[PDB]
Amino acid sequence: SIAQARKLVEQLKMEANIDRIKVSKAAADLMAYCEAHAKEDPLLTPVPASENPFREK
Amino acid sequence: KKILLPEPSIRSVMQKYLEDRGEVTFEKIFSQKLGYLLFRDFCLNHLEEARPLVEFYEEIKKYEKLETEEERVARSREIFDSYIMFSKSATEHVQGHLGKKQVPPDLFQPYIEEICQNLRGDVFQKFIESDKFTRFCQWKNVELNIHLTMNDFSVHRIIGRGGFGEVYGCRKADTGKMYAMKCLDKKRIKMKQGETLALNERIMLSLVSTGDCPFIVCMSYAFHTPDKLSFILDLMNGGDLHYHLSQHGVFSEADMRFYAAEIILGLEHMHNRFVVYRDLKPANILLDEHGHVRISDLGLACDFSKKKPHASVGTHGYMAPEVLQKGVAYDSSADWFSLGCMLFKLLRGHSPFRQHKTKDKHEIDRMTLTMAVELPDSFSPELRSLLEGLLQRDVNRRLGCLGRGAQEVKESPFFRSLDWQMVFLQKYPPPLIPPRGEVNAADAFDSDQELYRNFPLTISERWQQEVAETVFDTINAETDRLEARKKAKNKQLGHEEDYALGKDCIMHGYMSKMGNPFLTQWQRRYFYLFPNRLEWRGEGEAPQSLLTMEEIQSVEETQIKERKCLLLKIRGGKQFILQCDSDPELVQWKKELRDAYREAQQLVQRVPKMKNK
Amino acid sequence: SELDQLRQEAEQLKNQIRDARKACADATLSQITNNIDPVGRIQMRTRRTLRGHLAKIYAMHWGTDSRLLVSASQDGKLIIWDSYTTNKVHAIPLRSSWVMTCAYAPSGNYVACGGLDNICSIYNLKTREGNVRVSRELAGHTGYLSCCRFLDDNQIVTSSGDTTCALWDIETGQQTTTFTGHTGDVMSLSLAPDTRLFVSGACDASAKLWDVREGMCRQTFTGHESDINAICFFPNGNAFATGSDDATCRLFDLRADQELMTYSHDNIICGITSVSFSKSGRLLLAGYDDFNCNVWDALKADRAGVLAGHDNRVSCLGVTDDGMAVATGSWDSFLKIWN
């Protein structure tokens, strides 16, 4: 297992060298997307029986 | 009555049943009558390259039965110069025989192994793939599900009578073959205390009953009932030689020669399978209706393949010295002495050692032990040598006990005239044709149920020739139309039946489920067993119902009335009961379900997505 | 020595990672959303009870037309349904009975699937004949295929029990690229919307992230006490959810590179089998082994409702590309469409 650890150090080296934003911000971009696209999300916004392929026709 | 072949879907289960036992090889299928025939049908017609080779094998096979030399001399040259005549030193073995004007039956026998070597492989793979192999599986299923009762035979006239029962003549309904039926009484056997003898006869019959021997009363089936035991034997409606001797009086030398010749090969047969007959006496030889003979009543016979017997069993007239003495073991030697006593009685009307019509058993034995062969001077030179040879009290000298067995007797001057190929071929005329309508042709002078538990039995080689001679080619035709109609019915309708193909199907075929657990109402369906589930469909559809390997908790047998069922206890504690159409399908479904449900539960445990916790 | 240096230099890195993780942990998503309005009491009703499969359902997937869905069963089939009619467009009996996963190409042309067969098989539905054929049988893996996904009709991505994933050229039929890292059986995978990255979740209790064209892992995510049965991308290609055997779901973020939320309850003891996001991101739907599916508020982590239709275990699920519907397949053998 000479290569097994040498791969893991090379690999974790890769996983460390990335520019990381923060949880308040990321949480807000998730919330920003949710809120933004919430109009077009049928499961939140009860769309009427006309709009729904699975209600009547 | 008639035989109903199961449908060609039986192939799936039976291909597996027989593959489990090792029986889908050129050797095991070619070796079977019904197997060879289907193989040949294929090569001559439905494969072009194979045409020359099988034709050659058949021209070789025809050649082996040719009776005269002249026929073989011509048919050697015709086979050598023929359009068919691949090998190097095959030609040299035959060119050496042809150059020295010699032509035995086994002349072309070197080509037999080598034609077989070219018929394995490519050609045999093409047979298994062919429709001809399917048909093999259909016949083999019928074989392994035979359960006989009185009702499967048509019982005719009483043709034997003894202290424990009676023999009857009969026909077997489904092929029309004719047979005999021996029927022993259990209540009597209890009072007279002969449970061993009954059971011994059954074992002995099964030893001798293969190789289609013209000279023994062989068995094809055995079975029993609450009061009676029963054997199904070669038909011998002609009476025993104890009646016939007492009718005809004594026999000629040339007449006895015929009986000797046949009995000898009958003995050659038992001896090549290591059986000592023990009770040879006129009352146990028996005539067909051309007058050819066979040996019978094996109840005192013995396997000498393992331990050579010591008991004084036989009949006081006809025992060898070695039999009469306790502490002395014996082999087939006893038969050649018995033959002499019996052949001497055929020539003189009493055992050589039953002097002065005495019942004093004690005296009879000491004459057998001490005194010697008072042969009349009327007996010929070649005959005198024979009986002196057979009646040696010391085995060392007894004819047929020196090394080469029955051929020591065949080479005797007494049989010098004979072409022993013609003898085995029943091609020599018999001396006594029995008359039609003869009473008493084979009479004799006058908890517990556990002992006969395993009594039923069937012989494959016998059931297969029975079929091949009789119903085979017509049933194959009846079935080939029946099948080809329904394949025209599937092709024209635009509906092929291929739900098994191109997947991972293990085994498919019909069985019958009970789906009304209070009611007892049975339903027949086509099952597909896949590695994880037992699917089942009804008439003309894809499958709509199933049971998972996962859900099955045990697979037992239960009896409901006279239905042998599989009882799957299912999670819930509910009971799923299944009934198969035949014994081998019950054995295979019980095996493949256990093997699939254990294999599934073991594997399902190893998969996170599939297991429960 | 050489071993102990390169095993402690790993902890030195894993710490440098775990510090940069905690550096970014200023607030909880739960706090960030503590104020926003509850989703309400989301009661979905069963709309389609899709009977047909004859024993346990294990996987399903929707086509890009938001209507045709493929599903995979213990009964050994793919059924390409039309969810609107409740009707089957194709039943594709399969070469292997042990099917676990299945997929649908974006073009509508091809589908793919696999299972304990260790093969991902491509099916062309645009033959000259007017039926379904097998164009390619993509072989190369060494353990049970547990998920697969087409990027285009020339190329596809696969995950397996052997602890690997891979990209295939379908034309030549060979692995263009291979993806190693995981240490227990891989159970699920999710592609990005741009399709240059994708993610895997496994019985190691971790999830991972890959560049398609480079060929190597970028980021790895832990937290669960037990097997991760399911994974799905957040709609924008910058986060993803998980379902786990410890009785909880969880959300993780790509740029923030860590756990944001845990969805759970003292009453709930059983495990989780599948996750999908609604089209916006707001609902996280998950399937359980107490026979119910629970709708979680993705941001507030409240139990927003109970899809309580099935009479045994819920096993798979999916949301349409147009957001109109949620499909749940169960061990009782029925799919259900809800909204």
Ligand SMILES: O=C(NCc1ccccn1)c1cc([C@@H]2CCNC[C@H]2COc2ccc3c(c2)OCO3)ccc1F
């Ligand atoms: O009781 C019989 N044999 C002795 C025995 C058998 C089993 C157990 C214990 N003891 C017996 C004997 C005969 C006769 C008695 C005289 N010698 C011939 C013998 C057998 O008879 C046969 C008569 C016709 C046959 C045949 C055999 O085989 C084919 O056709 C008939 C029925 C019998 F039950």
Ligand SMILES: [Mg+2]
């Ligand atoms: Mg003795």
